[PDB]
């Protein structure tokens, strides 16, 4: 069996997603009308891998699934002949730019800049803390902190967003992560209309 791999990307760059099983691509072998696809998951770094027999496939994003619009959505004809690469281009709503999360004693200061692509408005923004690198909207074994006011005031490319400072003095997992020297963070923009967040890269704060 061969491996079909690739990236979900925009303008040359793989997207930062919720890994696990939240974002799926579809592979069709009998035409789109037959509505019988193979499921392929996309990881937190925008990469997918599928174990397939050689042959002809049509690959497409799953309608409505992922922090992007249907712009340019169409089937991509793929010939799998041994291990094969095929990227998928999408148009995101937003990207999280210049993400910074800094540790100051027991406090965390997080900020970022908005890049507006398709746009449509920002539903919520939040950051996550974790003792490991696997951090997303559901997995965050130290904290998740959301802000939801005035987000329309940041709905423009280049706008700097600064979170309220958060103190983690009595969080045993946090204090342990400090002492073990292992604290990870991530930031998310949730676009209005999206089923999924778009993220910064994972940041190691300590």
UniProtKB/TrEMBL annotation:
Coiled-coil positions are none
| DUF3823 domain sequence ranges | 2-91, 94-202
What species does this protein belong to? Bacteroides fragilis (strain ATCC 25285 / DSM 2151 / CCUG 4856 / JCM 11019 / LMG 10263 / NCTC 9343 / Onslow / VPI 2553 / EN-2)
What is the protein name stated in its UniProt record? Exported protein
Q: Name one Pfam family in it.
A: DUF3823
């Amino acid at each position: 069996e061969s491996m079909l791999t690739g990236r979900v990307m925009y303008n040359g760059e793989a997207l930062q997603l919720r890994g696990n099983e939240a974002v799926q691509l579809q592979l069709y072998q009998h035409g789109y009308a037959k509505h019988d696809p193979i499921n392929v998951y996309v990881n937190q770094d925008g990469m997918y891998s599928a174990n397939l027999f050689d042959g002809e496939y049509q690959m497409i994003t799953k309608s409505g699934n992922g922090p992007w619009t249907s712009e340019g959505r169409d089937t991509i004809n793929v010939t799998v002949a041994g291990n094969t690469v095929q990227d998928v281009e999408v148009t995101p709503y937003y990207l999280v730019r210049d993400a910074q999360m800094t540790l100051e004693g027991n406090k965390v200061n997080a900020s970022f800049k908005v890049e507006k692509v398709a746009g449509g408005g920002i539903d919520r923004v939040f950051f996550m803390l974790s003792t490991t690198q696997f951090v997303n909207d559901a997995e965050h074994n130290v904290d998740r902190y959301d802000e939801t006011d005035n987000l329309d005031a940041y709905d423009e490319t280049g706008k700097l967003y600064t979170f309220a400072t958060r103190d983690y003095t009595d969080n045993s997992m946090f204090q342990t992560a400090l002492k073990r020297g292992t604290l990870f963070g991530r930031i998310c923009i949730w676009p209005k209309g999206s089923d999924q967040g778009i993220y910064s890269k994972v940041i190691r704060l300590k």
